[PDB]
Every structure is written in C-alpha cells, then in structure tokens.
C-alpha cells in the first residue's frame, strides 16, 4: 500500500500529514469549541428551569383522566395459577406483600404527619394552596382492616391458596385532581348499585357474554359499604408538599370462579371527570384474564 508516507516521514516530522505543532492547535480549537457548546447548552437548560414551578406542572392535559391499575403486577393482564402448588402463586403474593408495606398500621404512627380522617366517606379536604405557606401538609391515614379478607391479617396468601384470588385496584395520582362522582337522576349510569355522594364508584363485570356466566360472585372491600374510592383524600398535593401520601385502595375478590377456563374481566370507574379511550385500554378502566387451573 501507501506505507511510510501518509503515516510518518521524519524528514518533515509530519504524522498523518500534519506536524506536531499543527496537531496541537487543531485539537485546542475543538476542545474550546465543544467547551463553549456545552456551556451554552447548560445555560439554556438552566434558564428554562427558572420558568418551571416546583409545586405544579405547566401542562396537565396529557394525564387528565387518570388510569386505573391493579396491584398484582402481571405481565400480559394474565393471572394463572394452581392453588395446590405453592410455587405458581408465589410471585403474586410477593408483589402484594411488597406493595402493602407502607399501608401497615405500624408505619402510620407519626401523629405530626398522619391524621385521623373519618371512617365514613366524606367531602374533599382542601389543605390550603400550592404556595408553601404552611409547609408540609398532613395526610389522611388508610387502615388495612378496611380490606378485610384481602389484607394480611388473616390468610397471608390473599386467597390464592384456597382457589378464590383477590386483586387490589387503585386510581393513578394526578396532582390537583378532585374526582366528581355522577349525579343522582336514577337513570344516569349503569346498571344499579348503592349510590353515595362521596364515593367514586367502581364495578367489575365480565367482558364477553360467555364470561358473565362463568365469573360467578364478586366481593368488594373498601371504606364503607358502597364499592369505590372515598373522597376525603384527593386532590393530592404532590410529593414535595405531601411525602408519605397514601392513596385509597379497593380490594376485589372472586369467590366462585369457574375452574379450568380463561375468564375475561373488565373493571370500570364511573364519574363526570372520568373518561375512557379506545386506544388507551388502561384509562378509566382495565381488564384482566384469570385462569385457575385445577
């Protein structure tokens, strides 16, 4: 090839066609150039961060109706297990136990942070304003005993050992959001359940028509007797003003599932604020497929 000419000379001392005092300047230029570019980039980022608040986002319309999720964090909306096989349902129980750590009664004893809101559903509690004039805001404390037959004060496999499994439903946190339950015209929503003016109602039914004959009985567990989310929480003040906030939960158990069939179940939440989508199959709603092998 072209050896010993375009690599090194030592009759002009030109490595790669450039002398050593010329290699220094062309590298000093690029070091200074990329230094000033990094400086201008950091400076524009820093200036843009001054227009950003630290209590409220600038735009909230892309989380505007929240999602609705279920706590055994599963992989394709599928739950499948054998009750007489303690290695099939172990990951589900581990997920539920790791989620319900902060909801324990021994983790809510700090009375200067937590407070004792009522044991019946009530109106939303305005903690003030997003202006840092009162420091940290107190949080209502959620008792685990309201999730009875679904909490860890009993069967610690949460029903998975004895057939009938149970999920825990929660609504996604949106900063400043107060959910509006539907009105009471007795014609408005579907089909019929117990109505409460301070409860956002949730209902879990079968998806297809052969699933309504196989899902069996469905039990709900929450605060009170009307199934849904209580309203003396909301609207949440953000994790700067309210660390250790506890969102309300709702447990759902399926006591009479049909064996050896895959059952599709749809859970929907109703309200004026709550809206649904056709591409987002997790907005205001979700679905799960349960298959109890025997």
């Amino acid at each position: 090839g072209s050896w010993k000419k375009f690599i090194w000379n030592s009759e002009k001392k030109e490595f790669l066609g450039r002398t050593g005092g010329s290699w220094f300047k062309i590298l000093l230029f690029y070091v200074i150039f990329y230094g000033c570019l990094a400086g201008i980039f950091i400076g524009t980022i820093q200036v843009m961060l001054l227009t950003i608040s630290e209590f409220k986002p600038t735009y909230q319309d892309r989380v505007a109706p929240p999602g609705l999720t279920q706590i055994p964090q599963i992989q394709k909306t599928e739950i499948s297990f054998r009750p007489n096989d303690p290695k099939s349902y172990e990951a589900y129980v581990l997920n539920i136990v790791r989620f319900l750590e902060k909801y324990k009664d021994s983790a809510q004893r700090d009375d200067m942070i937590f407070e004792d809101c009522g044991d019946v559903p009530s109106e939303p509690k305005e903690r003030g304003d997003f202006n840092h004039e009162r420091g940290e805001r107190k949080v209502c404390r959620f008792k685990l005993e309201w999730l009875g037959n679904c909490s860890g004060l009993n069967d610690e496999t949460y029903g998975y050992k004895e057939g009938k499994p149970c999920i825990i439903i929660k609504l996604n946190r949106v900063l400043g959001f107060k959910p509006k339950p539907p009105k009471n015209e007795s014609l408005e929503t579907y089909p019929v359940m117990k109505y409460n003016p301070n409860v956002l109602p949730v209902q879990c039914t079968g998806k297809r028509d052969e699933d309504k004959d196989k899902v069996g009985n469905v039990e709900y567990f929450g605060l009170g007797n009307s199934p849904g989310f209580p309203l003396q929480y909301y609207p949440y003040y953000g994790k700067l003003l309210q660390p250790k906030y506890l969102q309300p939960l709702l447990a759902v158990q399926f006591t009479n599932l049909t064996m050896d069939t895959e059952i599709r179940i749809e859970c929907k939440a109703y309200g004026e604020n709550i809206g649904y989508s056709e591409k987002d199959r997790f907005q205001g709603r979700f679905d799960v497929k349960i298959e109890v092998k025997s």
């Binding site: 524009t44 961060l49 996604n172 946190r173 900063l175």
Partner: protein, 976 residues
Amino acid sequence: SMDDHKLSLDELHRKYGTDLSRGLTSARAAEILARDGPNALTPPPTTPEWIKFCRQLFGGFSMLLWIGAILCFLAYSIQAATEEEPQNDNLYLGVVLSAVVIITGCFSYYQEAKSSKIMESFKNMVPQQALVIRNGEKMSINAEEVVVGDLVEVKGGDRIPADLRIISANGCKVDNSSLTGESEPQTRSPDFTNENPLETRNIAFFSTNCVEGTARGIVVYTGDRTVMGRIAGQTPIAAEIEHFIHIITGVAVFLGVSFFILSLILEYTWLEAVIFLIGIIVANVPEGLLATVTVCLTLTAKRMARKNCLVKNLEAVETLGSTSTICSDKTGTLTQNRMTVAHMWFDNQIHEADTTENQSGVSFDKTSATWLALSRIAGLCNRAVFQANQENLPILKRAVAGDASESALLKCIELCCGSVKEMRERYAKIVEIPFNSTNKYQLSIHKNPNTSEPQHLLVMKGAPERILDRCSSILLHGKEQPLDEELKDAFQNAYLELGGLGERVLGFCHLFLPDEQFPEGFQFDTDDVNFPIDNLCFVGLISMIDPPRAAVPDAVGKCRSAGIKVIMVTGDHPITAKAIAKGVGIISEGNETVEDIAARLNIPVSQVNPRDAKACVVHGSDLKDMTSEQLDDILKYHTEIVFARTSPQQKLIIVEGCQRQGAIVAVTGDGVNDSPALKKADIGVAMGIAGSDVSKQAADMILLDDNFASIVTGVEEGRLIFDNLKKSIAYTLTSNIPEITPFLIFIIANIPLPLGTVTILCIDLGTDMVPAISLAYEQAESDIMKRQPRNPKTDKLVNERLISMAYGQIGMIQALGGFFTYFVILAENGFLPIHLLGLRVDWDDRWINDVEDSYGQQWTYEQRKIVEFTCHTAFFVSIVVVQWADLVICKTRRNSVFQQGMKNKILIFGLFEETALAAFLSYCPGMGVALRMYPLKPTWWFCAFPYSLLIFVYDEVRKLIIRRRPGGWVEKETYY
C-alpha cells in the same frame, strides 16, 4: 445502387428538371420540397418517456423503501388474518413508505426532464447554410432544404450539404475520412476515373469538406438516401461525485447495520428494526446530489449561450473554468475588422488620411504620375467589387463582397481619382494569383489599353518587408532611381511612425514587362513561371487603421486579475502587433521588452541580459529555428508574449509548448488549417460569423459574435460551477448528525427516544429535497475573477475542511438545537432532566401503567407515548428551524449575505416550502393516527431560535476573519 457518374452532362439534362445554368426555379423548390422531405437525418429512434419514468421511480436506493412498504403490508396482512382486534398501524407505515418514493421519484424525474429539455435545444442555434444558385441568384439556405436536381457551389472549408455530382471544379481536394478513413486530400474533377462512385475523381459525398478550391456541382441524393446517409459520456466532475457517493454509502451501510443489530438487543419487534435500518441508510446517502450536477452543468450552458459562447458538449463547460492560457488571434477577435485608409506614404512623404467629404481638402491629390500609378496598383490588384443594389448611397454605406483589407482601399480610390469600373474599362485581365498566408503576395498581369507604355504591366501588393526585396527600384518622381541605404532608412523610419499608431500597412509595386522580346499578341501563363518576379518597381505604402473592440481592455484586465496568461499570435509585423498590444493592454504599462531598454540605454542589443525584460515579441521566422528547449524558455521567463509574422501552421507548436509547461489552453481559430491546433488545445474556440465549417466542426465551443470579451465571460461562467457545487455538498451533509445522535444518546444515557424513523424520513424529504437544489441557481460572488485557476489534479471537490465543517461544527449545533426542545417539552409536562436519566426501560414497558414523574403523578403507557411523539414532532420542527440558518450561511463562501443580497428566488421558495410542510404535518387532523405526529404549543416553536442565531453569528464572524486576514490560520483550517 449505381450513381449517375457514368452518364455525362447530356443525360444530366435528361435525368433532372432541365437545369444546368442560371438556377433551377424558386417555385420548383417548393415543388420538390413538397414531393420529397427535407434534407434531414434521424438514426436514433426514441426511448419513450414511461421507461425513463420507471427508471427513476424504481431505480437505485428507492427500491429499499419499496421493499420496506411491501414488508409493512405483509405484516399487516398476517395481523389482519390470524388475530382479533387487527389494529391497523402497520398499514399507515406502508402508505407513508409509498408516498415518500412517489414524491422523490416525481421530483427527480422533473429535474432530469428539465435538464434534457435544455440540452436538446442547442440544435438550430447555428444551423447549417448551403450555397445554391436558385433562379434568383446565389442564395444561402437552411441546408435541410436542398432538393435533388439542385446546383450548389462549395468553396474551401465548406461542408458538402448533400450527395453531389461535380460539374465545374477549380482544384477541390476533399477529405473522405467520413467513409474511407484516409485523411489525404484527394482531387475532384468532372473527369472520369473508375466505374464505381466511391473511388473516382467524380461525385462527392454527404458530410465531407472541400479543404481547398471551389467547385460547382448538381445534387443527386438528398436526405436519408445517400451513400453515407444510409449506412450509419461521463463528465470528469460527475465521476468525482459518484465516487464520493460510494464512500458515503459504505459509511451509511456500516452505521445502519450496526444500529440494526443494536435495535434487536433492545427488543424492537423485527419489523421496526428493518424499517429503522432502511430509514438510516436512505437518510444518510445523498443520492439527490447526482441530479444537482446535471442541473448545475446544463443551466450553466444556458447562461453561456446568451453571452454569445456556445458549447458543443457538456465536458467543455467544466474545462472552460480551469483555463490558464488564452492564445488568440488579433484581426477579428481583438479588433473590429473594419479597416479604413489613413496615412499613405510615397515620394518620401507621409500624406494625410484623406477623410474629408469635400474634394481637395488639406493635403491630397497633388496629381503627379505617382498617385495615379499607386491608385492603379490599388485598383488592379483587387478581386473585390461592390455588390448589387448600391446606387442609392455613395461611399461610407455600401456593402462590399470580399475581405475587409481589400474593400477598405476600394473605398478610398472611389472618393478621388475616378471610379474602379473605369479602371476595368481601361485595362484588361489575363491571370491572377490569389493571396495566401504562406506567400504574402498578390500579383496580377494586365494589358494596357494604350501604347504610351506599350509594354504589358503586372501589378503586385503584399507585406511591405517581403515585397521590397522583390520590388526594388523605387519610382519616386515618376523616375527609376536605384536604391540607397538612406532610402531604406527613410522606408524603415516611415514604417516606424506608421506602425507606431497601431496601423496595418501594405506595400505596392509594378513591373512593365517589356515587349522587346514578346510582342503585343502573346498569350501568357503563370504557374509556368516565365515572368520576372525580381527587381520590380516599388511605389509606396498605404496604411489602414483597425479599431479595437470596445469591451477588450476590460477583458484583458479581468484576465490579468484572475491569473490567466494571454498570448497574441498575429500574422502582422512586430511593430503593428506591439502597438496594438500596448493599446489594448496585453503588454502592460510598466513591462518592457529587450529592444526599448536597449534603445533607452543607447547600447547594442547583444550585451543586455534578457531577464529584466518581462515582455517579448517573437518573430515568426525565428520560431522555425528554435528547438523544443529554445521555445519553452520563452514561455517561462516572460509574462507578456506576442508572436508576429506567424503562419497558421506554427500555432500547433505554440499550443504544444504551452501544454508542456502544465496549462489548460484556450485557442481561437477560424480557418481550414487552424484545425490541427483546435483539436489539440484543451478548449478550441471557433468563430461564428467569419468562420469556416471545418473550424466549427473541430472546436469545443463557438463564439457567436467574434469577441474576445465573450471568452472571458465564458471563463467566469465556467468558474461559477465549482463554487455552486461545493455549496450544495456542504448543505446536504449537515443533516446527518441530527439523524444519528438521538439513537446513540438513547442507548448510552438511557433516556426515552428523542427521534423516530418517520420523522427522520420527513426531515430528509423536505430539507434535502428542495433547498439542496436551490443552491445551484446561486449567482456569482464579488471576487470570482480574483483567484488563481484551479489545478484539476490537486483541488478536489471534497476536502478535509469540508467534512470537518459539515459534520464537526454545524451538525453539532443542529443536534443540540433539537435536544434542547426535547428537554423543554418533557420538563414542561412533568419530567425534569435529571429524572430522565435511566428511565428508558420502564418508559418502554407496555405493562407498567403507573410511571412516576418528578411531581409524583402516575402515567399510563399510551399517555406517555403521546408525549414522546410530541417530542418527535418538535425535533423535526427544530431541525427545520436550524436548517433555515444553515441554508442562509451556505450561499456564500467568503462574502457576507449583506453584500450579496437575497436575489435567489428558488431559495426563498425552498424556505417557505420547508415551513409550510412542517406546519401542515403537525396541525392537520388525522396526522395523529397515521404519522403519529401531534400538535405543538405556539411557544414551543421558538425553542430553536438561539441555535439558528448562533449558527448565523459564528459563520458570519468566521468569514469576516477570513476576509480581514488572508492566508491566516482560519483560512488554512476552515476554508472549504
């Protein structure tokens, strides 16, 4: 078939429409033009337009997007067959990949058709002309309208218009290299040689030339019926572009395969990886830089032909711009070629110009025998006559047949001393010798009407220093006084102060052939040289002015500024040539030859060192006695060289000598024997008005107005294309860093992906389709004729400086301008910049529908993908905004845009097209489900304005440093 050469002239009456004299008929011309077709020729059939369209639509690099669209439709068909909820998002990808090739195929076809329409329009610009002898009288016609049974005349240098049959020939020798291949001139005559019309002295053929002589002949075969009518690429600047595209293709294919095998590691579901591969390789290769060359070359030729400079192939355009030496003739090119008579000399007296429109003015018409004798020489040596239809004007306005230098003194001896038809009345005619540039003579023998001098007299004119040795004994006061050395001193001083004014001079003499030997009845012959051509009777000199063309002294200055050597090659005396060269400015004011510096020091000439003289005047007889090493050292030390008394055969030696010193030579020629010099120089320039056909068959370009300034404007137009190509190459390469670096930061820093495949295709489609072609219409700069000629073996199109400017500097600011907008949108929706580091795995998990942001809110998967696709949309918009400033800074190279202007309108249409496409692709309804492009807030459109302004400010200040300090460090490292 048998041609009518065996049958004689009686059967030529009885084979065609009864004409062998006085023309055929002007009315029968339309009859035969109605009976048969025009005298045309088309052997290429056609290739149709649809196959040329399909070559563009399915060609190179556009079949990748066709197979990508096929794979998208295939994946959609498998999803729609075998599953419920078909979710047609692989159909919209297929129609996007279809629309992109349809748009780029239509655009490249439109560019190729617009270039071909200009290129097949340089026909019918200098059409052929044939000399027929129609009923009327010797007219020239469009030469596709020659009919059978017509009678044409062909002189020396003309191309034969159709297949002939020679009737009356005066020494035609033709060159039958069209069908034999031999380049030897073979004679033609109405005599018979062979019983075959291919090897006879008879009939001549289509597409040949009489290189000498003059012959009249009848037409037998026209059109696609003749003997030769029946049986019958890659510009060196396009080769560099299509070699550079190979290396960019290699780098793009490597980057595409290396990104493809990393997309599958991050679980991209094979179709997305393949479409990403195809998008990277298509966006990183500048295929549309190949049509730009064809747009840049062809349009340049269209600018040249409107400046009277007509190229014949596209390879001549790009070699005109690198010219280093122009070897030009003088009469007709540097001067106007309209001679007038001034400052005669006889009886040791320089007379006055005789220009008044009143007779017996200041000083003329002292009627001795001398003036009537010299007028007899001026009238009886001429073959030029006044044309017809001219008894309406008197002297200054008539049209004269023949050359200019004979018509000029015809226009002088009509003012005084009677008429010239009176002189044809008086004296007789026997024989003549026509002037050629190898003898410099013109002599003619004539019979006196009277017996006052009963001896028969011959008249002679020519070049004065070549006449005087023959025509010796000066007739001073009607006498026969012999020569003295002071008589030749008076002659030399007279020629000195006649050539000092820049005047052309001729010399005149006569002999009186005495009838002591041959009586009054005695026939005479010439090429039998039986008459004395030595010791004749000299009379005196007549000079003519020749005014220079009005645009020449600015053109010589523009050649001097641009570093172009100009060599004057004349056939005149070294006095007149030196005076004309000092007049127009070839020999500059400040350079001197050896002779004037020897005369100003009063020292003899064989003592001065020839290295303080920058100028030179080389006699033509000394050029024969120069060896090949004695020639190029005159082409090396002197800057201003003038060759005088140079025969047109000696031009080839000068061309080869200039080429042996490493130059690109442009050479002007207009004769039959100028053709060896024309197809040896790098640019042959023929003349269009006073030009032969053999000259404009052998030249690379034609001067439509015979002007030296038009060659210099052709050099400017050839110099423009390298700037205009470099600017377009520098613009197309800057959009590769923003199309590559998002995936690298996505895989290194683990942030959500800032730019996707569809928006890469949109970026490339808009911002590299129209504004890349707009930079070929850019005008010139203020200093294009202020730089050295490029050396087309050392200066390439693509440097190291160009690559480091396009990739290393402008592309990085263009990438940062989009990354800033990305962080702005994600910070305003709720994800601050430090939170984004390491979020890629949870963000792209389809079954995690509560992802916590900086404020504590929880996000569904399709809720956060809409924010990511808004970020993709604004990346595309910010790239458009910085490409505005890139296109504005790329239009100059060292001038600023404040002293250049915004007169390019294709560029402004490209800017508006960019902005309109970016606004429509974002704000149209239905774009969210097809392209997945979402609307932007109005305040997010101004996020890339600081980086556009930074590009503009930096690239203005760098050009100011280049202009203020030439040869500095910045011009070494940043001048591409």
